Design a protein around this ligand. Structure first.
Ligand SMILES: [Mg+2]
Lengths: 223, 42, 108, 100, 136
């Protein structure tokens, strides 16, 4: 009874890669999707220089070794959150990829907000949505900037509410408030499609694992 | 609903469908006045 | 939040000139909250009525709760000197039985 | 497993060198009226105008020829702290690629 | 009741504090996950500042040794009349074949750059590649 619930929720945290997210991606796979391509040196943020492999004739290149390490952590965190039945909200303001990101959230079984973000959505949730509204447990920022080249309002407002954020950060973004930054290209369609696939496969695996874990432990109770 | 946190889940759920329809018509490829004496709903 | 207590630190009657009313008055209240066990916060509430400004500040401050580290539960871990804007503060760690010897607001 | 450093050294984009006045092959993925959105293998797409000659030939998926100018159009202006970018590339459409 | 102070600490440290304070009685579901698999860097606020005086960034300009050869090829013959295909991961351009042959001759031991550049042009001419020495 109580032992089974402890097994379902506490056993997953005793393994470094419980969901085997390492196999989903590789440095070679990321390089095919152009995840190493950054903005010009003029557009560079000072807090992104750690993640930048170098400047190839004006275009910053993103180290895909740091990206692989950080992406492993971010996918690992996103899976445990999905395993525990947490709410995951995808957030982006890029209108080229608005339909793709809304389609991904629907495929995963999660939520997407790709439209104009209302001031107070998280800091004033009860008024906007209702008294007992449950806020997201994780926000994934496929794009961390809005369409005026400023940080998305939900980055600061998600920290105010103490919500962890998994965000794709490019060479012109500010990763300081992103809990799990993933350095990588955010503009190319091939990069965004790769990231959307990874987050969708990861979330579906974690949800499937929970069902199997519950069936095995549940069956033991009669058996 | 997956668009609950947008604040207009039904307006954006409808705008999601019509934008997906447009994409398939644009990807896949007569007179358009199939209906006359009609107006768009207010 | 029965374990939290609220204290007033300043009540001010600021004024905004308006064409309709000429001089219009608002009550600006600064309050602090704490549970006496390491957690405390402050906020400012403004309203036209003093009772409303008290409610606004009191419930706003509960959303800005710092946790303050106490050495053995009775003093700060080390001397602290800082300047915030033009205000200078020089705090000193003291032994038990020394008591609070500080600005009345700091005592509060 | 090949290292990222090796991948970058032998990458087609690293071989291209400077992208000014280079010739590249692109693919039309989006068309809005007479505006063609062309992916030439870089970070940002370019946007060209449908040529008067053989206008009907330029449909989605059509591979074309281009003369790159910039991979990203950016420029710092008076009083700016960062370069303003329009998230677009600069290229001159030369015409369709011969399938051969 | 919370800590809407996003410029002091991090979501994890502020959540740790609210639990020690006595205000948050139930752990968030994401908390234990962060404890076991934290990020590489702690997500703490830092105000961006400009560099002043003689402070400079630390970004290495990416220049391989082939660029010395490639620069000469583009200045002498321009870009190959064949168009670059940046969608083929194994594309070999006219210039990249020039640099592969120039390297091969350099392995043999030729030390003169002038010798390696005119010999490589002859080898590609035998291969049949159309190299135009366009000064224009
Ligand atoms: Mg970008």
């Amino acid at each position: 009874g109580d032992d089974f619930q402890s097994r379902i929720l506490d056993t997953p945290l005793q393994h470094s890669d419980f969901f085997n997210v390492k196999e989903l991606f590789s440095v070679k796979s990321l390089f095919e999707a152009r995840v190493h391509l950054g903005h010009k040196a003029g557009c560079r943020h000072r807090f992104m220089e750690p993640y930048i492999f170098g400047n190839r004739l004006g275009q910053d290149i993103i180290d895909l070794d740091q990206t692989a390490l950080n992406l492993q952590l971010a996918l690992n965190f996103t899976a445990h959150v999905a395993y525990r039945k947490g709410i995951i909200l995808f957030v982006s303001r890029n209108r080229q990829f608005s339909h793709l990101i809304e389609t991904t959230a629907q495929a995963c079984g999660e939520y997407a907000h790709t439209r104009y973000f209302k001031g107070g959505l998280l800091t004033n949730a009860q008024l906007l949505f209702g008294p007992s509204v449950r806020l997201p447990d994780l926000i994934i920022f496929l794009h961390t900037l809005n369409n005026v080249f400023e940080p998305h309002v939900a980055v600061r407002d998600a920290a105010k509410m103490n919500i962890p954020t998994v965000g794709i950060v490019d060479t012109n973004c500010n990763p300081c408030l992103i809990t799990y930054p993933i350095p990588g290209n955010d503009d190319s369609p091939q990069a965004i499609q790769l990231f959307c696939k990874l987050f969708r496969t990861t979330i579906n695996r974690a949800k499937e694992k929970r069902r199997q874990m519950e069936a095995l432990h549940r069956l033991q109770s009669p058996k | 609903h997956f668009l609950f946190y947008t604040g207009k889940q039904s307006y954006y759920s409808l705008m999601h469908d019509v934008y997906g329809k447009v994409m398939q018509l644009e990807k896949h490829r007569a007179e358009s006045r199939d209906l006359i004496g009609s107006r768009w709903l207010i | 939040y029965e374990d939290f207590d609220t204290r007033i630190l300043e009540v001010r009657n600021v004024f905004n000139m308006t064409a309709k009313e000429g001089r219009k008055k608002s009550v600006r209240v600064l309050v602090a909250v704490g549970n006496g066990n390491g957690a405390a916060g402050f906020a400012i509430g403004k309203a036209a009525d003093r009772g409303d400004a008290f409610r606004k500040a009191k419930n706003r401050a509960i959303h800005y709760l710092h946790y303050i580290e106490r050495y053995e539960g009775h003093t700060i871990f080390h001397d602290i000197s800082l300047r915030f804007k033009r205000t200078q503060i020089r705090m000193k760690k003291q032994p038990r039985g020394y008591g609070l010897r500080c600005h009345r607001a700091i005592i509060t | 497993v090949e290292s990222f450093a090796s991948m970058l050294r032998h990458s087609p984009l690293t071989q291209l060198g400077p992208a000014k006045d280079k010739l590249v092959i692109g693919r039309i993925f989006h068309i809005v009226e007479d505006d063609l959105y062309i992916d030439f293998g870089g970070k940002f797409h370019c946007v060209c105008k449908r040529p008067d000659v053989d206008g009907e030939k330029y449909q989605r998926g059509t591979r074309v020829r281009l003369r790159l100018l910039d991979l990203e159009l950016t420029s710092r202006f008076l009083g700016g702290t960062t370069d303003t970018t329009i998230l677009e590339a600069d290229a001159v459409l030369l015409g369709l690629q011969e399938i051969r | 009741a919370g800590s809407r102070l996003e410029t002091v600490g991090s979501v994890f440290s502020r959540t740790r504090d609210l639990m020690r304070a006595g205000v948050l009685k139930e752990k968030p579901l994401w908390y234990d996950i962060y404890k076991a698999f934290p990020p590489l860097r702690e997500p703490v606020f830092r105000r961006p500042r400009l560099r002043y005086g003689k402070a400079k960034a630390d970004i290495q300009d990416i220049f391989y040794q082939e660029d010395q050869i490639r620069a000469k090829f583009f200045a002498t013959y321009g870009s190959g009349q064949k168009a670059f295909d940046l969608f083929n991961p194994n594309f070999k351009s006219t210039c990249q074949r020039f640099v592969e042959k120039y390297t091969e001759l350099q392995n043999l031991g030729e030390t003169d750059e002038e010798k390696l550049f005119v010999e490589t042009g002859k080898a590609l001419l035998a291969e049949g590649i159309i190299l135009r020495r366009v000064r224009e």
